[PDB]
């Protein structure tokens, strides 16, 4: 405890939490154009080759977004819808591509948790 006089002279300040996803500009999700697509090797001691895309957003930012699900068809110039979410493996990847978005479609032959990958219901 500082003395009440001390608190009166130099009032307490609470430190302000900071956004994990600054490029969204407090919008739930944004749209951009895939300026490049590639695979990247994660940190240690993981193994795989994760597929990411360098995207120029509608507001002028560059970001790098992960492409979830098995297989995809993102070429260059493809418009996409990114949302928040950080991939721990990848340094600098801080957004996710939404499946079932404008130029991205669901992962083929998905039967559990379809809505997380934008795939229509396989008719029974």
Partner 1 sequence: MAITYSIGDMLTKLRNASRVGHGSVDLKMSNMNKSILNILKEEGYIKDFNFLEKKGIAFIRVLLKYDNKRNPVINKIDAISTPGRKIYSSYRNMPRIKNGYGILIISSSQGVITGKEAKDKKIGGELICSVW
Partner RNA sequence: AGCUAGUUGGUAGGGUAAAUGCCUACCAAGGCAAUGAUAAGUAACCGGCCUGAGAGGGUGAACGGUCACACUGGAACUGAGAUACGGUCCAGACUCCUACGGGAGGCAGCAGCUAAGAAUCUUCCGCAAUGGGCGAAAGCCUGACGGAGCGACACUGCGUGAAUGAAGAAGGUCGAAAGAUUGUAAAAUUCUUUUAUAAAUGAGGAAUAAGCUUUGUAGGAAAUGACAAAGUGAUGACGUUAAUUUAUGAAUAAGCCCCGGCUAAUUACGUGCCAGCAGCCGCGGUAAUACGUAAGGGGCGAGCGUUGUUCGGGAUUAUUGGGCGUAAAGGGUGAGUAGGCGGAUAUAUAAGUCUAUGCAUAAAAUACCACAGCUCAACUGUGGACCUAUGUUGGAAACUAUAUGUCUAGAGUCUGAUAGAGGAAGUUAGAAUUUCUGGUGUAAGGGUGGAAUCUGUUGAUAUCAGAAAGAAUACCGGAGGCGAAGGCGAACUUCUGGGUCAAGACUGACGCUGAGUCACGAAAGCGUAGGGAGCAAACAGGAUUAGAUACCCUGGUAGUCUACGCUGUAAACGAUGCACACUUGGUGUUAACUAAAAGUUAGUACCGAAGCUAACGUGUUAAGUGUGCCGCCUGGGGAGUAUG
Partner RNA sequence: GGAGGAAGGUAUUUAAGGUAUGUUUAGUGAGGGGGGUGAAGUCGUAACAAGGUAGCCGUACUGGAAAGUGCGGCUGGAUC
Partner RNA sequence: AAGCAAUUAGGUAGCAUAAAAAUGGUCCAAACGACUGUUUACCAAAAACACAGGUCUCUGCAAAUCUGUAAAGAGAAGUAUA
Partner RNA sequence: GGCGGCCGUAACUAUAACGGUCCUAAGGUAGCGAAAUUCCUUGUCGGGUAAGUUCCGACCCGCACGAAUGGUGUAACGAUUU
Q: Using CB under 7 A as the criterion, which residues of the chain lie in contact with RNA when the complex forms?
A: 1-7, 9-10, 12-15, 17, 19-21, 24, 26-31, 42-51, 58, 68-71, 81, 83-91, 109-116, 121
38 phi and psi, to 5 degrees? -165, -175
Residue 17: alpha-carbon gap to chain centroid: 19
* 3 lies in the site for partner 1, by CB under 8 A: yes
Query: Where do the H-state alpha helices sit in the chain?
Result: 4-9
The binder of 10, among partner 1, RNA, none, by C-beta within 5 to 8 A per type, is: RNA
Q: Binding string to partner 1 for residues 5 to 44, with x set by CB under 8 A, is what?
A: x---------------------------------------
Query: How far apart, in Å, are the Cα atoms of 108 and each of 43, 71, 81, 101?
Result: 28, 8, 19, 15
19 phi and psi, to 5 degrees? -60, 145
* 4 lies in the site for partner 1, by CB under 8 A: yes
To the nearest whole angstrom, how small is the minimum distance from the Cβ of residue 108 to RNA?
A: 10
Residue 95, token pair as written in the block: 């957004």
Tell me which residues touch partner 1 (CB under 8 A).
Answer: 3-5
């Amino acid at each position: 405890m500082p003395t009440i006089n001390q608190l009166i002279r130099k009032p307490r300040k609470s430190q302000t939490e900071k956004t994990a996803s600054p490029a969204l500009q407090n919008c739930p999700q944004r749209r951009g154009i895939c300026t490049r697509v590639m695979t990247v090797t994660p940190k240690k001691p993981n193994s795989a080759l994760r597929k990411v895309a360098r995207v120029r957003l509608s507001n002028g930012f560059e970001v790098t977004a992960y492409i979830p699900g098995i297989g995809h068809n993102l070429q260059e110039h493809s418009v996409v819808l990114i949302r928040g979410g950080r991939v721990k493996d990848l340094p600098g990847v801080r957004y996710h591509i939404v499946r079932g978005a404008k130029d991205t479609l669901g992962v083929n032959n998905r039967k559990k948790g379809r809505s997380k990958y934008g795939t229509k219901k396989p008719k029974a």
